[PDB]
């Protein structure tokens, strides 16, 4: 990646890069606002838009999808990216667009789905789609949500909140939970999500914060792990990430803790 970010070292990705693992032959669908494929630093292998007012998945009028695409490649430089536009320029989307993106990812044999998006109430139809994706063997990763805390209540957003989906919270460069990072027993792992520098539309770069930035560190880590263990199932990849995480404190705030892709890749 052309923009330096602490987050790649923080999850111990350089150790795997040094071993020769960069996520070769792994298909990662970015279900987001698009990917600006004109970025000199991003190669997008294919895609689809399901946003009827925004018909080009290879442009990004929001900036999130391009940023997230860059983070996946910063962690897994050889991953194959797919731009699946399910959110419009305002970063908002309908359940149906998301389902269409999940179904496209199944039909096109994606290895990993990243969904840096959430709703507070969720959708039974989205649940059926993500569960189908996971049953078909896709690693499904989502942002845990930016809804902070609510006493003893879970604030994890949908679809992260569903058991089939890996819910990723955000830490800063000091491994402290970001104040915005959602919490609850559904939180699975943490990754870097504060002031992450990555690709922006119009050939730009810049820092963004959110569980949206934490999720692609884990999507990229899944790509690294599959490159070292191409025969592993999604269940095995998920188990590896959860079972080898660095514990950071109470699981309500931190889940299993910070992903350690060096440890997870065995």
């Amino acid at each position: 990646a052309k923009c330096v970010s602490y987050g790649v070292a923080q999850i111990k990705a350089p150790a795997l890069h040094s071993q020769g693992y960069t996520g070769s032959n792994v298909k990662v669908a970015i279900l987001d606002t698009g990917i600006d494929s004109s970025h000199p630093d991003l190669n997008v292998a294919g895609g689809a838009s399901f946003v009827p007012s925004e018909t080009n998945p290879f442009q990004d009028n929001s900036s999130g999808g391009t940023h997230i695409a860059g983070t996946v490649l910063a962690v897994a430089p050889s991953a194959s990216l797919y731009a699946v536009k399910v959110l419009g320029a305002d970063g908002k989307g309908q359940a149906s667009w998301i389902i269409n993106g999940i179904e496209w990812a199944i039909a096109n044999n994606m290895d990993v789905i990243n969904m840096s998006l959430g709703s507070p109430s969720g959708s039974a139809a989205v649940k059926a789609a993500v569960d189908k994706a996971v049953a078909s063997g896709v690693v499904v990763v989502a942002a845990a949500g930016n809804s902070g805390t609510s006493g003893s209540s879970s604030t994890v957003t949908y679809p992260a909140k569903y058991p089939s989906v890996i819910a990723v919270g955000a830490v800063d460069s000091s491994n402290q939970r970001a104040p915005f990072s959602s919490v609850g027993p559904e939180l699975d792992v943490m990754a870097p999500g504060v002031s992450i520098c990555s690709t922006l539309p119009g050939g730009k770069y810049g820092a963004l914060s959110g569980t949206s930035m934490a999720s692609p560190h884990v999507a990229g880590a899944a790509a690294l792990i599959l490159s070292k263990h191409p025969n592993w199932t999604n269940t095995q990849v998920r188990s590896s990430l959860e079972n080898t995480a660095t514990k950071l404190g109470d699981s309500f705030y931190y889940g299993k803790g910070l992903i350690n892709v060096e440890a997870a890749a065995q």
């Binding site: 987001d32 970063g91 908002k92 359940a95 998301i98 840096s116 709703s119 845990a144 959110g210 999720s215």
Partner: peptide, 6 residues
């Protein structure tokens, strides 16, 4: 549109 970028 209840889903938002995170």
């Amino acid at each position: 549109e209840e889903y938002s970028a995170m």
